Scaffold this active site. Structure first.
Site: not given
Lengths: 111, 244, 198, 241, 243, 250, 242, 233, 244
Positions: I31-32
């Protein structure tokens, strides 16, 4: 020097009847000549139809009572919900007590 | 992980043999020959030195014959450094026995202890064994003259004459040939020397290439004397024998 | 204290040791054997603090027996003693020193001579013609200093011990209940069953 | 620090190092023990990698764990030293705390457990040794013979052997030992032990050493000669035919 | 066996491959540095390369302040360089506490060398892929520069350089010294010595510098400090009116 | 975490060789030449200062180290490995000797100590042998003058003279002709200088040669006066100048 | 090589599976559990006629109310039994009563997975799984007669009957059929004896098969050769009909 | 490939995978099925117990950790014991030292941290069991899902074990419904049972087969097995 | 040869530490989350993939506080990140206990670096499978930091990591170029919401839950607090708006 002990007074009495038993205790808690509390219970229900009181040095009495209830908690866990008979609770306490034989729990207990 | 780089020095082959032990023995067979011959009034330890030169000082040198205590000595075949480690500890176990019981230590006890230290590296720890073999020459009130031998597997045994290092089979055969139960020190020396003479991987047996030692219980005294021959004396004993 | 006497005659060592164990106000037993055979030709007598006494004795026994087997040989008396001394000298600086005193009487089969060593709880060792631990020595050493001769027989030594015992029964305050005598010679160790009346 | 699992399981349920230790056992000289009606005999053949030995000193194959118990083995000589000592100590310790010498079984169970232990502890290889432990239980006259192996397994035998060619001599025992009448005498038991040993020792007086254990601490090793007498009389219970 | 290229053990030619590779690692950053000694100062220049615009340019440095007196510049990745910095600080402090005087450059160097030697000999410790140049004006020895590497080597220099173009700088430097014949820049102010420093890094790398392309550190009697972009510029200007 | 490398990194090959040890001996072989000649009244050890750049400062590197005031050591192989061995060797001379007998250890014993360390690196779990060989020269009231060589295996031997490293063989051969048992130190120095010259590829002068001696007692180097038992250290490092003066008499 | 606590791509612990294999080669052990007791029978399996059959201990008592039969590398079981015994005695000491069989069993299985080489989870000091499995049978007041099978994986199950060792699949199958709620102690003895007979290579008799039972009234009793022989005989007749 | 990087948990594959952990996760998928689902007042656990023979017991899959917390296991039972035991201790400590019932959220955080140590440490081994945790505390009902990878997630419901996907989808639709089953224990249970039945194939869930556990507002974590789950089929 | 990537501390012939780099991959697969430093604080935000509707909304929090003035967000193997925060916490406490004042950001960061870098020094441990963006407010300013499995870290004007990394940095670079003045924490919160939104496009398949948190010298007093309610929706809105 630091004196690890104290006396909080109080008195407890236990009587076993044919199909019952009682464990009574007074409610005062003192220190020297001062009254610490007019109401501080020292006879407790520990589950499994077992009442206990460890009267003497409250700190110790408290610690003891705590360690026992907990022993009852784990007896259930480790031995599949089996009810701790009084005879067994007793012997358990002997061990709790004797574990501190060289720095005793300054208390006189009854269940 | 770390297991990746582990050689497992104490494992068994499918044949029930200990790699590292077998391989250490092999290392030892490339070492200078050492011989021990037990007489009726003494024991001779003789050894052939490996690594020589015109410049090497033989006077102040002792790379194969070591004194363990006043009544016991050992001849070494293997890594000289691994040797010193075992020696320094054997010397100590001798002194401990003494302090504890106020009696010199029985040769076999000293020996067995050393053999036990070696067997350890054989069974646990994960370290390489010591590439050393010993010929112990010692005297004691319970068995008198004794000659034992120990190697990397931690096994020990007693001998009338024996050798370790290079050319054992040759030397052994020669010893089985000329040795006889009722020998004498001056004779065993000769034998010791002869044997070395025919197993040497060199041209001629010179003094500078030898180390000789004897443990004699001289009659006019009582105390077991240990004499580690000095260069000049090797040269002499060598001429007497005729090798020259 | 309890009585521990030992006297080295010409061809043996005789150890005499009291038969009583008293604790507080009562004599609990009147037949104690304050002795352990370290090896067939070595006997040790002991006295001191209540438990340390037997515990130290049996421990030393075990260790000497083990050595006997590992080497199928019997350590010389002198050896056994030096061993005992060091165990003591190491104990004296431990947390709880063995408070035990011992006499070791053994027949040295190699030298063919009886020996007697006196060692205290501090690991103080000495070889002697006769020795004792406790208060007994306070009487017996002078008695022996006078009546003892290097060339006595086992029988003469026993009689000498008799004198000692008598002097002790006369002048010591505690009723130690008599002694158990044991002779260590070339043929081993035997207990004189006839000393309560010889 | 060194804790590598050396004895471990392989795809088929074998612990190789344990099994390979059995091999080192097979590679060792034979040892036999057969028990009579009032005794137990333990014989062993002699090694031959080199000869010119000093028979006087070299640690024989049969060892006294205590005044009434002996132990012989087949395997790594050095490895056996450790088991013996450890056994001896426990022999003393047991005396000290129970005030009674060990039973052969106890001693057996002890040595056995030490072996098992080495087959599942890190950093160590199993003992390359199998043992025959015999003697008599304190105050009892019924002979005891037990055998232990590197796995740690143990059990008792009327007669048994271990070491090289034990397969051959076992057979001899299997045929010559009748459980209805064990060699009813020190003599016939020794004989049967020698006969068995002969079948593989291959005619060698100085190649055999025999030990007899009787009740109440009576343990005696035969003289090179008394055995030679057995070898002699035995070659006749084959030649008279 | 064939694992002799994973842990610090000898290879059949008598070499420690892991040490060798560690040396190659020092170049990963692509920065060059040099250090020269003045008459009574020591300057070390190191290029500064800030690629990303998303970074806070001031947090980028391979020059470290070890003690009030010792300065150190690292040629190698940052996580290993920082690991060496901390320890060098811990060590310089401990030395002051236990011995009553400030740890000198060479000794600090030597100590740092010895730990490296250790990684060289024990399997479990991987060497640090960095080269450390310690500089200071030791109270006993004068301007100093001592450098150590992953093999555990360390030594003192009249001037040094390190990085991908080590050889070019070194040769330019050696030359300057054969010309002068002395062992230090014969200059009074550290400002000037800093100039020579940059000047010659330019002459040898065949490049021009902007203020955010360098990192300069000076060490004088009783102090070592890093220059500010502006102090650097004052320098950049001074040289761009000489050359 | 933790050094789990608890097993030997030097084991036995089926040919009975200890690989890591032979390999360390190779590393030694690749190292610069160093020698030591023993005189009747002295000992000299020398070697070349392989200045690894002209920018480096030669003086700031002692390849020849004083172990005690009467003992020195020089080497050939991996310098770092050496440097740490000197540290230890210098320490052990105190912990296992001066702190117990009140006097510095004798050459052979000190050597014996150094050797033991090296051996350990050959068997202890998790390490690699030292990649060095040393020549230790000293003197002690009871053994006179000596010279020892210690190999990575941990073996040591005394020499009348020897050389180690690169040009070992040639040098060993050159010494065998010149050496004899009536050499006065100056002459051995000389010989050492000659021997060294032949291994040295380029520049040869006091700035590239590190030669030290173990000879007579030097009170001017004690640092104090007033005690007539401590006569002065016997180890002296020759100065650049002192070397040149002998070089200019080639 | 790889560690001793490595998971296969199928999600199982190698060493565990492997030990389970070694267990397949053991002497059969069968236990059947009825409202009148629990039978545990095993096959001695002498590897030679000179071995004294009675010196084969494959059925042990843990406590008066708990018995146990093993199968596999039987030397590995020694430390387990010990722990089982100590665990039960100790329980009696701390609580003045008998340990529940489940509890005893559960205590034994806690040892199971304590093998490894520095497995960051606690202090696992055992180099390899146990090469043996146990049949633990006993009785307590709370849950009556019980039989448990304990494997080196740490898991243990309660069975109305179970067989372990070489003839397991076969015997298990037979048990499955023969078993029923209203069985009787003798019937059970028989089945064990019968089913043992089947999977046993040599002919079952008193010197190679061992029976034992545990009942509230008399506790863990290892049947003496004579009693078992009578049952064996009682079987030849029950089978020699239809 | 794989065969080189799957030797232990201290090795990353070239993709950034931890195979030992992944392999661990597989023993879970091998296990029987269990489901968890919570409303706003109760949290239930229904788990299918798995026998070995028709002659054996159905492995117990639910464990009470405290009067307010408990979990159902899927996979390697021992590892379940080790983990629940740890959950028991941390619950005990909060009561004893703070007189505070442990927050399920925190219990979660603690489990994750314990597993993680066996997924970055040498010679160690990931745990091989997944866990469904339910509990009621100062902030209502909760259900947590624990995986040996160290990942813990709080959900309105979920299921794990073989065929879990059946129930997991079922609940994913049944959500809007069950999350509103407030004040009616038996229903949620029912919802649970239905959900559990979505991952069946073998035979229908029976007495020896089913295991349900419930915790809630005025309901202490109680385990219902056999004789008492009859009314829920 | 090869194999230089089976052990964590081994240098390859090119001087890289392959296990560290394989670690980074575990990161990239995650995930960012980003961090935008501002005029007097820093803002953190992370994408939180909505695996299913079964997930209870706004509960599985991911951003973490260290002490009371530090926010920590990471992408990758979540547990590795948590592990890294536990140490951070412990190291923060240790600093406060001994020095009273709460741990300065630069100092906190280095404490983190050193612990991570340490995980690339031995083959008995694996590096961290996370990159961490963290920072906060201290005695002299706001500080944003990002740390990689190699233990490398530096100070950032903005920072991002995870799958959306590139688009994120794209946006971030935009912001730094357009607003050299700085950004108000109020604005940054919005901007972060955007950047995350955009960055979700590189994973436009599953729906997401936005999560922001900030630490600002005038909006949160220098204390880390999460963004909830009124202030949260404002940003979610500003985001969904500029997505088109």
């Amino acid at each position: 020097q630091f004196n690890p002990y104290g006396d909080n007074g109080g008195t407890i009495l236990g009587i076993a009847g044919e199909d019952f038993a009682v464990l009574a205790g007074d409610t005062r808690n003192i220190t020297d000549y001062s009254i610490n509390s007019r109401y501080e219970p020292k006879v407790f229900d520990c589950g499994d139809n077992i009442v206990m009181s460890a009267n003497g040095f409250a700190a110790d009495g408290d610690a003891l009572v705590k360690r026992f209830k907990n022993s009852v908690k784990w007896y259930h866990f480790d031995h599949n919900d089996k009810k701790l008979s009084i005879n067994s609770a007793a012997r358990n306490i002997q061990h709790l007590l004797y574990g501190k034989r060289f720095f005793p729990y300054y208390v006189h207990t009854i269940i | 992980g770390s297991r990746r780089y582990d050689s497992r020095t104490t494992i068994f082959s499918p044949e029930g043999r200990l790699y590292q032990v077998e391989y250490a023995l092999e290392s030892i067979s490339h070492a200078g020959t050492a011989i021990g011959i037990m007489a009726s009034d003494g024991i001779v330890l003789a050894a052939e030195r490996k690594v020589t030169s015109t410049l090497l000082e033989q006077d102040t040198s002792t790379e194969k014959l070591y004194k363990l205590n006043d009544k016991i000595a050992v001849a070494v075949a293997g890594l000289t450094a691994d040797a010193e480690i075992l020696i320094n500890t054997a010397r100590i176990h001798a002194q401990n026995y003494l302090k504890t019981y106020n009696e010199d230590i029985p040769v076999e006890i000293l020996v067995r202890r050393l053999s036990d230290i070696k067997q350890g590296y054989t069974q646990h720890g994960g370290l390489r064994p010591f590439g050393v073999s010993f010929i112990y020459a010692g005297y004691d009130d319970r068995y008198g003259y004794q000659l034992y031998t120990s190697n990397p597997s931690g096994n020990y045994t007693g001998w009338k004459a024996i050798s370790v290092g290079a050319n054992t089979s040759a030397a052994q055969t020669l010893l089985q040939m000329d040795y006889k139960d009722d020998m004498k020190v001056d004779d065993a020396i000769e034998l010791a020397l002869k044997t070395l003479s025919k197993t040497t991987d060199s041209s001629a047996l010179t003094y500078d290439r030898l180390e000789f030692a004897t443990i004699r219980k001289g009659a006019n005294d009582g105390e077991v004397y240990q004499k580690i021959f000095k260069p000049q004396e090797i040269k002499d004993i060598l001429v007497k024998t005729g090798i020259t | 204290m309890d009585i521990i006497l030992g006297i080295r005659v010409q061809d043996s060592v005789i150890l005499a040791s009291s038969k009583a164990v008293t604790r507080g106000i009562s004599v609990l037993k009147d037949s104690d054997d304050k002795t352990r055979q370290l090896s067939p030709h070595t006997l040790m007598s002991f006295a001191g603090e209540a438990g340390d006494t037997v515990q130290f004795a049996e421990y030393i026994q075990a260790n000497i027996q083990l050595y006997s087997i590992r080497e199928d040989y019997e350590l010389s008396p002198q050896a056994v003693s030096s061993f005992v001394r060091q165990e003591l000298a190491k104990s004296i600086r431990s947390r709880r020193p063995y408070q035990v005193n011992v006499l070791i009487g053994g027949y040295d089969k190699k030298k063919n001579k009886p020996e007697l060593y006196q060692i205290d709880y501090l690991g103080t060792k000495v070889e002697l013609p006769y020795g004792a631990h406790g208060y007994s020595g306070f009487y017996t050493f002078s008695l022996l200093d006078h009546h003892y001769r290097p060339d006595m027989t086992t029988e003469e030594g026993l009689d000498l011990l008799k004198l000692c015992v008598q002097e002790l029964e006369k002048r010591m305050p505690m009723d130690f209940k008599g002694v158990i005598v044991k002779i260590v010679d070339k043929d081993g160790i035997r207990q004189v069953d006839d000393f309560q009346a010889q | 620090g060194y804790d590598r699992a050396l004895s471990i399981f392989s795809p088929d349920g074998h612990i190789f190092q344990v099994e390979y230790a059995l091999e080192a056992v097979k590679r060792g000289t034979c040892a036999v023990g057969v028990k009579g009606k009032n005794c137990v005999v333990l014989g062993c053949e002699r090694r031959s990698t080199l000869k010119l030995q000093d028979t006087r000193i070299t640690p024989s194959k049969v060892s006294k764990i205590d005044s009434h118990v002996v132990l012989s083995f087949s395997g790594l000589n050095a490895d056996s030293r450790i088991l013996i000592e450890k056994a001896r100590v426990e022999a003393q310790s047991h005396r000290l705390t129970l005030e009674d010498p060990v039973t052969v079984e106890y001693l057996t169970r002890y040595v056995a457990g030490v072996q098992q232990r080495y087959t599942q502890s890190g950093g160590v290889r199993p003992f390359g040794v199998s043992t025959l432990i015999a003697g008599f239980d304190p105050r009892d006259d019924e002979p005891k013979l037990y055998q232990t192996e590197p796995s740690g397994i143990y059990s008792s035998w009327s007669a048994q052997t271990i070491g090289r060619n034990s397969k051959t001599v076992r057979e001899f025992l299997e045929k010559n030992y009748d459980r209805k009448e064990p060699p009813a005498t020190v003599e016939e038991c020794v004989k049967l032990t020698v006969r068995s040993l002969l079948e593989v020792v291959q005619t060698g007086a100085k190649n055999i050493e025999i030990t007899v254990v009787k009740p109440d601490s009576d343990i005696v090793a035969l003289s090179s000669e008394e055995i030679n007498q057995y070898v002699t009389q035995i070659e006749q219970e084959k030649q008279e035919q | 066996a064939g694992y002799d290229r994973h842990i610090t053990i000898f290879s059949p030619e008598g070499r420690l491959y892991q040490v060798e590779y560690a040396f190659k690692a020092t170049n990963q950053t692509n920065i060059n540095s040099l250090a020269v000694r003045g008459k009574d100062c020591t300057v070390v220049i190191s290029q500064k390369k800030v690629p990303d615009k998303l970074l806070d340019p001031t947090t980028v440095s391979y020059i470290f302040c070890i003690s009030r007196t010792i300065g150190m510049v690292v040629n190698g990745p940052i996580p290993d360089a920082r690991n060496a910095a901390l320890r060098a600080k811990a060590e310089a402090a401990e030395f002051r506490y236990k011995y009553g005087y400030d740890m000198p450059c060479d000794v600090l160097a030597k100590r740092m060398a010895n730990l490296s030697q250790i990684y060289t000999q024990r399997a479990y410790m991987r060497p640090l892929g960095v080269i450390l140049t310690f500089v200071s004006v030791d109270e006993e020895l004068g301007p100093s520069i001592y450098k150590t590497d992953p093999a555990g080597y360390y030594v003192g220099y009249k001037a040094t350089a390190t990085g991908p173009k080590q050889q070019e700088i070194t040769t330019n430097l050696e030359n300057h010294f054969k010309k002068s014949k002395i062992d230090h820049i014969n200059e009074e102010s550290w400002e000037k010595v800093v100039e020579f420093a940059i000047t010659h890094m330019i002459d040898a790398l065949g490049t021009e510098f902007s203020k955010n392309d360098l990192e300069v550190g000076v060490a004088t009697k009783d102090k070592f400090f890093t220059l500010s972009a502006e102090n650097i510029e004052e320098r950049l200007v001074a040289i761009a009116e000489q050359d | 975490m933790t050094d789990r490398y608890s097993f030997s990194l030097t084991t036995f090959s089926p040919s009975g060789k200890l690989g890591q040890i032979d390999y360390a001996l190779t590393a030694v072989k690749q190292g610069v030449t160093s020698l030591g000649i023993k005189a009747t009244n002295g000992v000299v050890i020398a070697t070349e200062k392989k200045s690894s750049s002209p920018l480096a400062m030669s003086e700031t590197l002692s390849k020849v180290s004083l172990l005690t005031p009467d003992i020195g050591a020089v080497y050939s192989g991996m310098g770092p490995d050496y440097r740490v061995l000197v540290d230890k060797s210098r320490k052990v001379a105190h912990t296992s000797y001066k702190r117990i007998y009140g006097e510095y250890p004798p050459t052979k014993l000190l050597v014996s100590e150094v050797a033991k360390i090296m051996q350990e690196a050959t068997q202890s779990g998790g390490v690699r042998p030292f990649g060095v060989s040393l020549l230790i020269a000293g003197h002690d009231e009871f053994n006179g003058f000596s010279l020892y060589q210690v190999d990575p295996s941990g073996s040591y031997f005394p020499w009348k003279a020897t050389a180690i490293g690169k040009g070992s063989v040639a040098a060993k051969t050159f010494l065998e002709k010149r050496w004899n048992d009536e050499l006065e130190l100056e002459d051995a120095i000389h010989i050492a200088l000659l021997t060294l010259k032949e291994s040295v590829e380029g520049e040869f002068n006091g700035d590239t040669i590190e030669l030290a001696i173990i000879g007579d007692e030097n009170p001017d180097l004690l640092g104090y006066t007033g005690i007539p038992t401590d006569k002065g250290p016997r180890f002296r490092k020759l100065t650049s100048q002192e070397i040149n003066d002998r070089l200019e008499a080639l | 090589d790889r560690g001793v606590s490595t998971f296969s791509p199928e999600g199982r612990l190698f060493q565990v599976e492997y030990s389970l294999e070694a267990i397949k080669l053991g002497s059969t052990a069968i236990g059947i559990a009825t409202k009148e007791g629990v039978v545990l029978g095993v096959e001695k399996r002498a590897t030679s006629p000179l071995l004294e059959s009675d010196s084969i201990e494959k059925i042990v008592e843990i406590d008066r109310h708990i018995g146990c039969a093993m199968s596999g590398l039987t030397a590995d079981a020694r430390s387990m039994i010990e722990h089982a015994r100590t665990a039960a005695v100790t329980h009696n000491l701390y609580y003045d009563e008998d340990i529940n069989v489940e509890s005893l069993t559960q205590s034994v299985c806690d040892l199971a997975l304590r093998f490894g080489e520095g497995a960051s989870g606690e202090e696992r000091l055992m180099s390899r799984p146990f090469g043996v499995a146990l049949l633990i049978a006993g009785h307590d007041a709370d849950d009556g007669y019980q039989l448990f099978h304990a494997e080196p994986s740490g898991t243990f199950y309660r069975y109305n009957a179970k067989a372990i060792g070489s003839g397991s699949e076969g015997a298990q199958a037979e048990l499955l059929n023969e078993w029923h709620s209203s069985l009787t102690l003798k019937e059970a003895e028989l089945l064990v004896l019968k089913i043992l007979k089947q999977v046993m290579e040599e002919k079952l008799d008193e010197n190679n098969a061992q029976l034992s039972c545990i009942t509230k009234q008399d506790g863990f009793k290892i049947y003496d050769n004579e009693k078992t022989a009578e049952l064996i005989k009682e079987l030849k007749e029950k089978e020699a009909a239809e | 490939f794989r065969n080189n990087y799957d030797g232990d948990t201290v090795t990353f594959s070239p993709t950034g995978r931890l195979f030992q952990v992944e392999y661990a996760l597989e023993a879970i998928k091998q296990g029987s099925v269990t489901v968890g689902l919570r409303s706003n007042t109760h949290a239930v656990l229904v788990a299918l117990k798995r026998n070995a023979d028709e002659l054996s017991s159905y492995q117990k899959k639910i464990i009470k950790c405290d009067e307010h917390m408990g979990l159902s296991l899927a996979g390697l039972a021992p590892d379940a014991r080790v983990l629940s035991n740890y959950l028991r201790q941390q619950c005990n400590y909060s009561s004893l030292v703070f007189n505070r019932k442990l927050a399920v959220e925190r219990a979660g955080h603690l489990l994750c941290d314990k597993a993680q140590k066996n997924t970055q440490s040498y010679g160690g081994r990931p745990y091989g069991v997944g866990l469904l945790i339910i509990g009621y505390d100062k902030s209502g009902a909760h259900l947590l899902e624990f995986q040996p990878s160290g990942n813990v997630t709080e959900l309105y419901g979920t299921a794990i074990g073989a065929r879990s996907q059946g129930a997991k989808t079922y609940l994913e639709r049944t959500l809007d419904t069950f999350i509103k089953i407030d004040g009616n224990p038996d229903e949620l249970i029912k919802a649970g049972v239905e959900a559990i039945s979505q991952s069946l194939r073998d035979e229908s869930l029976t007495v020896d087969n089913l295991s349900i556990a419930i915790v809630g507002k005025d309901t202490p974590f109680t385990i219902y097995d056999g004789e008492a789950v009859a009314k829920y089929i | 040869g090869t194999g230089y990537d089976l052990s964590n501390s081994v240098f390859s012939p090119d001087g890289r530490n392959f296990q560290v780099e394989y670690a980074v991959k575990a990161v990239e697969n995650g995930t960012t989350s980003i961090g935008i430093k501002c005029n007097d604080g820093v803002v953190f935000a992370v994408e939180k993939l909505i695996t299913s509707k079964l997930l209870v909304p706004q509960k599985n929090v991911k951003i973490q506080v260290v002490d009371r003035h530090i926010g920590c967000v990471y992408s990758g193997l979540i547990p590795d990140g948590r592990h890294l925060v536990n140490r951070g916490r412990e190291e923060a406490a240790s600093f406060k206990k001994l020095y009273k004042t709460p741990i300065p950001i630069p100092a906190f960061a280095d404490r983190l670096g050193q612990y991570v870098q340490a995980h690339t020094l031995y083959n008995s441990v694996r590096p961290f499978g996370v990159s961490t963006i963290f920072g906060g407010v201290d005695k002299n300013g706001a500080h944003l930091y990002m740390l990689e499995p190699s233990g490398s870290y530096w100070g950032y004007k903005g920072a991002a990591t995870g799958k959306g990394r590139q688009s994120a940095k794209a946006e971030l670079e935009k912001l730094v170029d357009h607003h050299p003045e700085g950004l108000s924490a109020r604005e940054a919160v919005k901007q972060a919401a955007k950047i995350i939104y955009l960055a979700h496009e590189d994973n436009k398949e599953k729906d997401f839950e936005l999560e922001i948190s900030w630490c600002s010298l005038s909006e949160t007093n220098g204390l880390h607090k999460f963004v909830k309610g009124d202030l949260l929706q404002e940003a979610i809105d500003f985001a969904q708006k500029e997505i088109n």
